[model samples]
Target: GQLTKQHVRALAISALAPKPHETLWDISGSIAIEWLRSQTTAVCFEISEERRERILSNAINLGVSDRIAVQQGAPRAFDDVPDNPDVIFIGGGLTAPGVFAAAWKRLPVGGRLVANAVTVESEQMLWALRKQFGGTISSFAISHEHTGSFITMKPALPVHQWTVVKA
Candidate 1:
């Protein structure tokens, strides 16, 4: 299954507006490819070599392999990354222990952060954080046009994206 679609990625990347000079973190796994495509550098942390290699190969396949770094660990207490990321995007792992907190803590004042959640628990978590820290939470949904016998909408999971500049 496709973990993310370009339409959804378009909004998240647009909202984040990362620059070449700023380091980024793709906590979700697949978003790093988009970041690299946009001429941004980022680190994607994954636990398995298979997952890690998949990320790298995706980068190469997309023809933007230079700045995407794959680290052999998840985001926890920020020790795995060589440097603090100026911008961070979290997806797929919001419910993971310490994943949200660890990423939230690393966002310094004026630092940019975006999180995309596809599940109820993670969506609620984004709202919870927004309540405390103050940010914009935008809802996104997609329905692909499918023509099997007739044209119809094939809906994908709705994504709730939280974006903010830490103050």
Candidate 2:
């Protein structure tokens, strides 16, 4: 499913649930970081060099460079990342189950863990994890209208989101 801009913001904001001065880990979260930058001291990871720089650029443009850190590597490469994040958001397209497990271990009690999935296979994986951990699952879709020579409405791809609190 192709993510619309609206869905990206909604997903990131809901998943992070960021509060003032909170720290967040955005795993494979380049797509959502632009919206998330103002919410928390976001640390976003991306394996692609160009994408990583783009996230950094966005942060700079938002004047939140001091609050956001863009890393160029897999989430696992940041093993030494600071602890006690208030929230952790795993991007919809990420396929690494191990990354989720590792992030789960790092979260403290009451800390939130959110994941988004746009495909059935990924949703199933998220569901399995949700069942094992206990959480809320929801689905969302949006239709956007474009007006130019003619009016057209396009439906963005549906997305499934899961949110869990560490017990």
Candidate 3:
């Protein structure tokens, strides 16, 4: 619904910058997994049944389903992660702190972690973690023009992002 904005997807994918064949882990990914999958030839993980299916459907439609793996379980910890990914995207906000820590630990030197937050609480949590881990924090506000009856600009929900490369 509200997550269908092109700018939001572009920002997340830009932050991750997945290379060809680089593995990506998309926690609570939703439709973003499709964007990532299109970039990399390696396996990608989408960790939610409903969202996973949405990704799967899109992937099949795009003929890229073979490279993406959709997991149905909600991850409670880093232990739930399937593989060590070159890039990890936390799209579900601050739902699991341990998952972030675990993913951080799993990242090899130079691996990247990108997280997006829409709430003040999640932003604060990501800020605290970013300080501890050392990374860049930025905010994106996107406006779209709706030209139905009259030309009006609608501001999509702002997204704050945290991106870090493992040292």
Q: Tens digits of per-residue lDDT for model 3 on 38-117?
A: 45743334455676667678767767777666654334434555567787787764556465665566778989888999
- For model 3, give the 10-residue run with minimal summed lDDT: 28-37
Query: In candidate 1, residue 101 scores what lDDT?
Result: 79
Name the candidate that leads on TM-score: 1
TM-score-best of 2 and 3? 2
Cα deviation at 136, candidate 2, in Å, is: 0.6
For each predicted model, how many residue pairs clash, with residues at least 3 apart or on different chains?
0, 0, 0
Regions more than 4 Å wrong, model 3:
1-4, 28-32, 35-47, 74-82, 147-150
- Model 2, 14-88: lDDT tens digits are 666667767887773453455454445777767778877687777777677777777656557557676566787
Q: Write the per-residue lDDT of candidate 1 for residues 97-116, one digit (tens) a residue.
A: 88777877777788888888
Q: Runs in model 1 with CA error above 4 Å? A: 1-4
- Indicate the residue-level lDDT of 15 in model 2: 67
Question: Using Cα atoms with residue i matched to residue i, what is each candidate's TM-score against the true structure?
Answer: 0.88, 0.84, 0.81
